[PDB]
Design a protein around this ligand. Sequence first.
Ligand SMILES: Nc1ncnc2c1ncn2[C@@H]1O[C@H](COP(=O)(O)OP(=O)(O)OP(=O)(O)O)[C@@H](O)[C@H]1O
Ligand SMILES: Nc1ncnc2c1ncn2[C@@H]1O[C@H](COP(=O)(O)OP(=O)(O)OP(=O)(O)O)[C@@H](O)[C@H]1O
Ligand SMILES: Nc1ncnc2c1ncn2[C@@H]1O[C@H](COP(=O)(O)OP(=O)(O)OP(=O)(O)O)[C@@H](O)[C@H]1O
Ligand SMILES: Nc1ncnc2c1ncn2[C@@H]1O[C@H](COP(=O)(O)OP(=O)(O)O)[C@@H](O)[C@H]1O
Ligand SMILES: [Mg+2]
Ligand SMILES: [Mg+2]
Ligand SMILES: [Mg+2]
Lengths: 449, 752, 172, 58
Amino acid sequence: AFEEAEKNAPAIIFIDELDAIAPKREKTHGEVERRIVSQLLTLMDGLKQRAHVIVMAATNRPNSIDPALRRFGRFDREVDIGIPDATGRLEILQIHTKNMKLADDVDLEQVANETHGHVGADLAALCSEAALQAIRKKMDLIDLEDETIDAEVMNSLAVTMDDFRWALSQSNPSALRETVVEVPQVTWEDIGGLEDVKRELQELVQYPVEHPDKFLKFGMTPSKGVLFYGPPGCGKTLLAKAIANECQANFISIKGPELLTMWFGESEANVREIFDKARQAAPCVLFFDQLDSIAKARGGNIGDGGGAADRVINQILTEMDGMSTKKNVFIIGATNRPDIIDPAILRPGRLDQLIYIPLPDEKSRVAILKANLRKSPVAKDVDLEFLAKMTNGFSGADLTEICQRACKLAIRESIESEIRRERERQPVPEIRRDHFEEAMRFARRSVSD
Amino acid sequence: LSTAILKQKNRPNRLIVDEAINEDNSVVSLSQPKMDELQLFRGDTVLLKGKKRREAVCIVLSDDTCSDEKIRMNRVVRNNLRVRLGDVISIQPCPDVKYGKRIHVLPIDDTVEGITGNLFEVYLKPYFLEAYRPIRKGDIFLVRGGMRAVEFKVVETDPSPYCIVAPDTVIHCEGEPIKREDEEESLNEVGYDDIGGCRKQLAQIKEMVELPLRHPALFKEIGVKPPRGILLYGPPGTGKTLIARAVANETGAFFFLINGPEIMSKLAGESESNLRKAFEEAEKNAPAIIFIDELDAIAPKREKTHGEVERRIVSQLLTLMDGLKQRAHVIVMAATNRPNSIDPALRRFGRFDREVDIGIPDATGRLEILQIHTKNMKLADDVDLEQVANETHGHVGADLAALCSEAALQAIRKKMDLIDLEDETIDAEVMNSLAVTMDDFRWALSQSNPSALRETVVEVPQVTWEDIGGLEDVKRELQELVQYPVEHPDKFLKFGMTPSKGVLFYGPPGCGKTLLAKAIANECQANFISIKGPELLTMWFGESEANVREIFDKARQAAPCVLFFDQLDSIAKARGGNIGDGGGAADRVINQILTEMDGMSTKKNVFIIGATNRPDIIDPAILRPGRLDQLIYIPLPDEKSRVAILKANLRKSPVAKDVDLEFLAKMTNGFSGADLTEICQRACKLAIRESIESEIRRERERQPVPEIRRDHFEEAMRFARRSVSDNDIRKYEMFAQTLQQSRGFGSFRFPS
Amino acid sequence: EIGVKPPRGILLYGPPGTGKTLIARAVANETGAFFFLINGPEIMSKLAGESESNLRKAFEEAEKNAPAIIFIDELDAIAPKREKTHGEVERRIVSQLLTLMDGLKQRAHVIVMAATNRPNSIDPALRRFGRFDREVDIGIPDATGRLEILQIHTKNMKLADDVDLEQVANET
Amino acid sequence: AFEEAEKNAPAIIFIDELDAIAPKREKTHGEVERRIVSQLLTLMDGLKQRAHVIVMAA
Ligand SMILES: Nc1ncnc2c1ncn2[C@@H]1O[C@H](COP(=O)(O)OP(=O)(O)OP(=O)(O)O)[C@@H](O)[C@H]1O
Ligand SMILES: Nc1ncnc2c1ncn2[C@@H]1O[C@H](COP(=O)(O)OP(=O)(O)OP(=O)(O)O)[C@@H](O)[C@H]1O
Ligand SMILES: Nc1ncnc2c1ncn2[C@@H]1O[C@H](COP(=O)(O)OP(=O)(O)OP(=O)(O)O)[C@@H](O)[C@H]1O
Ligand SMILES: Nc1ncnc2c1ncn2[C@@H]1O[C@H](COP(=O)(O)OP(=O)(O)O)[C@@H](O)[C@H]1O
Ligand SMILES: [Mg+2]
Ligand SMILES: [Mg+2]
Ligand SMILES: [Mg+2]
């Protein structure tokens, strides 16, 4: 190959997936692979004498490349093809839609804005999905088994903004395909109370991203961390669900111990990779539910155990430190046992902001009861203010349990009425006061003093 | 809208298949008004389109008995078109059919036996003389006459593939007989109709593999390429390989199959060469589909793969699917159980651009699967596949095939009285009388159990809601708990509240918690996974939480599923209570359980039931609603309950009428149910001792106790002891009273 | 007539010595089928691509001697869970076994029988319908059964008149 | 090794430190240990081959 490139000079050599042929020589356990890497190094050296050959390569695991091949005279100049910006995604969409028969109402600026972690494969996928939607709308007009298609349908067939909205609904970044979780639809209206917490969350998200120049000008680095701590059932994971559904930032929801693995060195690799793909999809929110699993106070269990949890927390802290201010990765942790968190997590620069999610007060309890029963048929004579007065220390989970108990009692009554109807043949419009009283006689307080 | 591609729209060419009364193999009958609609003259040849890419030519006929919407068509033409009765077939007039010059005929081997004369002399010669009948390749027809009519297969046609029969045309029967097994294989071909459930998934798959090839003008005019890569993922047995087989059998594209480990080779560069040969062969052959079964075998993550061969194979695949030289009209399909094991660069738009989730079907889907699998089986009238679809909860489609096969084996076992294994052949009477009844399906249902749950299968001792005495309120709560969300989700949607799905039984030892779990396991209509407390924990790092994750995942797949933790306090304990325990492996297990039961993922019909003696040590985040919503206290039975317990234990046992169980209950104060069962067992032991002693004394004299009497209970009670002391009762009462006082109100009533 | 293909995969499980190998051999001899034995560890090969190559060659031979009974002794060693094991070779072995047993191309007329002391260590996908239809538990025999076993091993050896195999049949 | 030994009709097979070759199955996690134990078992099940092959362990 190199001789052929020299013979027809000036020439360009392209080595697609360089990391396939050029791994680290110390790591490689084969003799033929080491011969390949050394032959590559030799030909790179001989290249400089070669008058007019330029060698170009591509890889998406650059660190896997042998360290010798990134020195002077061998791949000495490197180009970083990063994730595009909003203008970049607009250009990519304009490139990919130029042949497509776009309608008039379609605007590519909104599409470019809504796609956050997309890289260009994702945007091409988006345009292809929009086209499939536009075709699907016509499957009523012309069927598949049909031999031909009416030319009128072909003329009418075009891509509208509704197709792009559908594609945007389905589209998710290729990077985040692993970490996607089906999250229940939770809107800020579904949460009762915590209004100050909601506003603080929205601000702490959008301020460092939309306006970083002012954060520079005043000389203050933005916070990249929040910790939610509070009693169980008070709205931490609920706020995480709300942020995932509503806020226009990529969301990575991870359980605590999903990262940990028995094999040596794997756990830290998982931590590095998850922070990495939070970086690739930024602006992103990285959520550690039950943070008291992976970030536990170092040294208390130092004597007993394999000792890998220490390396896991060190890798987390190293990723939190190495993360740049300009990169917009927000890290949120939830813990209902805040003491057993490592203090080093709580030091400045990492999970700085501590948001205490208290037991709801009376107004917040009214808001919670109204939120749970917003979609539910509720009798008018049910007085939610009295329920909030009577449930003085109840957590939001307890109030949801009360509403679900009332639902069960009403369902039981309606089932009995139906059984009566089928028995005589051979009821319950909504949830009433008596159901709520029968439910409240069971109501218990989840959080002790 | 999503499944708009699957619709038929009642096209006038599509016609319902119906039986033909008098038509022969090369002719069919259609009603005269329909032939008026179709501009079809009598006696014309027509080209009929059928399922699985089969075309046949028959002579149209006018029938007054035939209906307009039905097409009358005999066994031969249907078995040619691979169509069952009631299916829809397309009809079009055959254009410029040219009289066949030479045609080759080969008969079926099972029919040729027992015939003396030459087949062409006897059957082919008169049938093909003055016939003027069109025929096509791949056609199997039966000609009447002779001692046995012989079925004939149209192997070769010149001109290919369809041609009319002329007297000057030469008819020769020379060649090998066509194997009947091969004809059966041709008939038993999987098609898009053989996939049940997964209508939306099949719609997307058809939109990718069928629509571009059928109507490339659509994508040419809309000015963008169709997606060209499908990754079918799902749990094992949901029908990914089946969808691949259907795609292969029912597409015009060249289909090239790759199985994962087949690529592997010792020689360096040989596996990459096999992959390149596969893709090159697909490229040479016009539109093509490549299916890579078990992709995760040959496409692991390059970061996590140690071997150089596997990393080079992944890189070769990446470069082939999307490289500097693009594919030309090649679709790559892949099926994998573990999609997250696939290398992340394969999961972008260039290579595997849409991933299709072949998930566990719902009730309607598994009913459709049952119909698909029982179409061939001859079923009685009592059989109700809808009931079987309801009773099977976590089955994925391979389990339903197993259920149907097991029902048929049970039907055959019912007939081994008459049938002989020793006899070589079976009489016609029993074989004709052989059929599958609903009892056979009930037996199969009893044995059936999802394959995903085979790991977590434990025998239960066949307890019933009758065997438990007392606890009426608890019994009703548990029955409602498990039955409402599965039987009447309509009510929950109408009231707009998610069900409560957590129960914790705490109470003194012996009082009926594991018994209630056995009753739920046998009685409730949902899958049951029984977990002992500490069977999840492992010495390996991070594997205990992995076991927790996989058991909760098994529960989610087999939903509705009841997950019972026999001793919750072992696995669930307050975090930070211990000094050692690894690096807090116990606390990590607690956190994993907390996240599984109420986390950011959406909820399924998984009911978690925990039983504990010591509910005070349990982590309070476990006891909050949303995780173990209700704390049910199973106390020491009271006197009515003790009567009920004694009646339940002695219900199957012959007992004397003099025995006053009411008095036994009145005396046994503070006794648990286990103690009363011990009293009954002791009475049984004393009775058995007396019985054996009587037997021995009879054996002595030669060389009594039909039922347990009152003296036996007197002795057994004299031995009996109370198991739960007053101190234990006080501790449990303390927990119960703390929970009650947590409310702060004796009772609650709304203002007037 | 009834319309169902017979179950073609059998897994025998029970402690060592319960006779799973000899049960398989007896079934192979008494029926008109060639007995082709596969042992787990001997299939396990060192280089990449020889293990599942040996599996392919074994299935191909057993198809050549159609009809035949393939007995895979120690299936737990050859086919552990793909999620559990870290080594690639074991995962590729399990995938090849799945493909050979049930795939877009399936076995036509062979019955596959595997023996394992512990069935839970088997990868679950093997325990599916299409592949290992039925699991037969060969356990410790009861009194009558061990009476039969004692008679069988004692047929060749001469026995005195005082010998009563019921004594040992109850005792063991 | 068993093949070469069984080629010789009269044979005394001496294994030194069998315990290292075959420790207990449940004692060690290593799957290659289970495979080595099972291979030893299948070889020793039919070592006799109706022949003078005998095996000694140390
Ligand atoms: N402020 C609230 N508004 C509405 N619903 C609420 C609120 N707080 C709690 N809930 C209800 O209670 C549950 C919220 O539990 P959530 O996951 O938020 O708890 P958590 O604080 O993460 O607790 P844990 O530490 O136990 O995981 C949901 O069922 C939700 O409907
Ligand atoms: N959706 C389905 N509809 C009808 N039959 C099904 C379906 N899913 C599975 N089956 C039955 O199960 C048999 C085997 O299933 P199949 O091989 O397709 O499973 P799978 O999940 O694709 O597995 P694998 O990918 O490991 O091959 C099929 O031959 C068919 O009889
Ligand atoms: N109400 C009851 N009706 C019938 N049998 C009962 C009842 N209560 C207890 N038993 C008897 O108790 C024995 C088993 O008790 P069970 O397993 O229910 O106890 P448990 O509450 O789970 O106790 P543990 O704390 O020891 O786990 C059986 O013999 C069963 O018959
Ligand atoms: N009916 C029987 N059940 C179990 N084992 C038997 C029986 N009859 C003989 N055996 C003895 O079992 C010995 C070995 O059993 P084996 O084939 O190793 O079973 P497994 O492989 O399941 O341990 C044989 O040498 C045979 O002598
Ligand atoms: Mg939470
Ligand atoms: Mg498959
Ligand atoms: Mg118990």
